[PDB]
Structure 1
Amino acid sequence: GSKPNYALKFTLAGHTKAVSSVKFSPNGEWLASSSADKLIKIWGAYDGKFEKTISGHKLGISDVAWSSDSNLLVSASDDKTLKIWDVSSGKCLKTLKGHSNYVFCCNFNPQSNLIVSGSFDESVRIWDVKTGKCLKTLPAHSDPVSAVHFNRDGSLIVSSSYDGLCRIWDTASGQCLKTLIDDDNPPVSFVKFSPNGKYILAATLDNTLKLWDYSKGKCLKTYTGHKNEKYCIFANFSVTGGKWIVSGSEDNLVYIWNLQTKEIVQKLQGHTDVVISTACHPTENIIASAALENDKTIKLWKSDC
């Protein structure tokens, strides 16, 4: 139908501190969760079946991301490292050392030969997956880096920071192509490219999401009605059914907007803390949501539309 009807199917309990992020494997079979409890957990995407725990970080994890082939994870930790994991064995393949403060955010490129990382140390780093070596250090921002994402062909990196900037980097050279948002405030708490790489979805800590045309460098859409003044809350493009924007909120709800109309089409109620992270299943109308330390659970929601 014209609107989604997401309904709770499973609650996934196990993390002992705040959940930090959830991501669906590109092949659709798994959900990965990261937590302040220093653990990665793997769950069945369709039945919420707990699969395994992946251990090794010495401090809390802020982010976890999947390789294109669904075989590897990368995690970003307060221990100042990233770890590349073999999902099948649960083994740490590489520890990426270089950041001088907490690593907050990470992603593979589509090729999954590189990792990008953002840190409290105000830098973005680009890592070789095979060797685990740092290839480039970008002096990207003047405050913690909130998010990092590659575009569809891997040629660009978008970064955001508490410095109030969103910047787009040339992957090959590490040089800045443009500063898309250039305000002193508010903090830009999240950014990512649209699936086709033409747009950037950006969250600011004034309870606002915006969709930007990258090439033109102007705002096409604004989404409001949720609460976001404190946390780096993820936002998603939902594309399997109706074309939505999905975001957690500091009022403990998941918000779903019509992308084109900007109307709120659903609020998912159930979490008992801030919903820090949502993910959209790659083929099914399924949302995963995760909450901070008063809740510590992941919820799987399913919609007919």
Structure 2
Amino acid sequence: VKPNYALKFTLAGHTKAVSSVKFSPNGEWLASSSADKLIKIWGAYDGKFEKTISGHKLGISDVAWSSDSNLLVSASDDKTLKIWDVSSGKCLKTLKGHSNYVFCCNFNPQSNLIVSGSFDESVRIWDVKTGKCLKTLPAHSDPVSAVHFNRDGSLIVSSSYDGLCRIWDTASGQCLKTLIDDDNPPVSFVKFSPNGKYILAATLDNTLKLWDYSKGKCLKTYTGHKNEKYCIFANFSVTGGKWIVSGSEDNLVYIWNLQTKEIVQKLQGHTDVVISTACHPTENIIASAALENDKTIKLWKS
């Protein structure tokens, strides 16, 4: 069984490389962030431009939705995160604390906390309501590429150019596990599986790996794409077949069968590295976004 994703919409508006795209949990919206310092909101189903959210002083590298689809958090080279009320467009809080560029961010499932990762090689945990830092984890010895909460929010997984994946106790801040394979390439992305059993990790040796967190073992490897230079998002696609989805530095979107690890589709159309992809929560829809030579977001439907 193979999907037949087909291009439906191309979304133009950002004036520099796109950084990160995410679908709202309620499925209505796509948020994008960009090196152009802007957040843009788009209709998830029609690709129709909705509004621009502005305020960061420098480029934004990541953006993420609150559980109720009402808030965004963004991570920027201005060394802040910003919490946004999407309807009003207002910046509710500016999170100051990192000493270098903030590269990655996420809400916990309860959306009372935010986790962030930075070039200052730390991971910080923030209180959403007060906008204050609760914990600072001396997490890595190189820039942090990704941070993600597990299903009940009790765990944080982080990745770094230092070659490590680490799992942290949210409440205590203690390192619970360090994961690394036979080699030490930079780890450029990590996230928990939807059921929370697994960890999907990208390394800059053109490889994605599915880990059993609790066993601390690599279960699956996904190859065939190009990933040696940039931190490319990866996803679990679950609305139809169970796929792994990733951008690639050959300007394609790759889709693998999660179980068999075979490539089942490649999406062609971007003119630069596909840095970010996202999967719609209820429809077979993928959003993809590319770097400076391209500047567009594309919406594919299977």
Distance 1:210 1:134 in 2: 31
The percent of aligned pairs where both chains have the same amino acid is 100
Any idea what the Cα deviations from partners look like across 1:105-158, whole Å, max 9, x if unmatched? 000000000000000000000000000010000000000000000000000000
Distance 2:87 2:125 in 1: 25
Any idea what the Cα deviations from partners look like across 1:13-58, whole Å, max 9, x if unmatched? 0000000000000000000000000000000000000000000000
Distance 1:188 1:264 in 2: 22
Distance 2:211 2:4 in 1: 28
What secondary structure is seen at the aligned counterpart in 1 of 2:9?
Answer: strand
- How many positions carry a matched residue from both structures? 301
Any idea what the Cα deviations from partners look like across 1:87-115, whole Å, max 9, x if unmatched? 00000000000000000000000000000
In the alignment, does 2:224 pair up with 1:225? yes
**Paired residues of 1:207 and 1:227 also in contact (CA < 8 A):** yes
What secondary structure is seen at the aligned counterpart in 1 of 2:8?
Answer: strand
Distance 2:150 2:128 in 1: 18
- Root-mean-square deviation (CA, aligned residues, Å) is 0.7
Who is 2:120 aligned against? 121
Distance 1:126 1:206 in 2: 30
Distance 1:165 1:296 in 2: 31
The TM-score normalised by the length of structure 2 is: 0.99
- CA apart distance, 1:184: 7.0
Distance 1:274 1:182 in 2: 26
- CA apart distance, 1:180: 1.6
Any idea what the Cα deviations from partners look like across 1:179-229, whole Å, max 9, x if unmatched? 022677200000000001110000000000000000100011000000000
Q: Which runs of 5+ in 1 are unaligned?
A: none
Shift in alpha-carbon separation, 1:157–1:102, aligned structure 2, 3 A: same
- CA apart distance, 1:279: 0.1
What secondary structure is seen at the aligned counterpart in 2 of 1:182?
Answer: coil
Any idea what the Cα deviations from partners look like across 1:51-100, whole Å, max 9, x if unmatched? 00000000000000000000000000000000000000000000000000
**Paired residues of 1:253 and 1:267 also in contact (CA < 8 A):** yes
Distance 1:183 1:280 in 2: 31
Who is 1:300 aligned against? 299
Distance 1:169 1:180 in 2: 12
What secondary structure is seen at the aligned counterpart in 1 of 2:173?
Answer: coil
Shift in alpha-carbon separation, 1:210–1:184, aligned structure 2, 3 A: closer
Distance 1:72 1:152 in 2: 19
Distance 2:180 2:265 in 1: 29
What secondary structure is seen at the aligned counterpart in 1 of 2:79?
Answer: coil
**Paired residues of 1:126 and 1:137 also in contact (CA < 8 A):** yes
Distance 1:210 1:125 in 2: 25
- More moved, 176-185 vs 250-259: 176-185
Distance 1:59 1:257 in 2: 35
**Paired residues of 1:164 and 1:183 also in contact (CA < 8 A):** no
Distance 1:285 1:182 in 2: 33
**Paired residues of 1:95 and 1:132 also in contact (CA < 8 A):** yes
Question: What are the equivalent positions in structure 2 for 1:7-86 lying under 5 Å apart?
Answer: 7-86=6-85
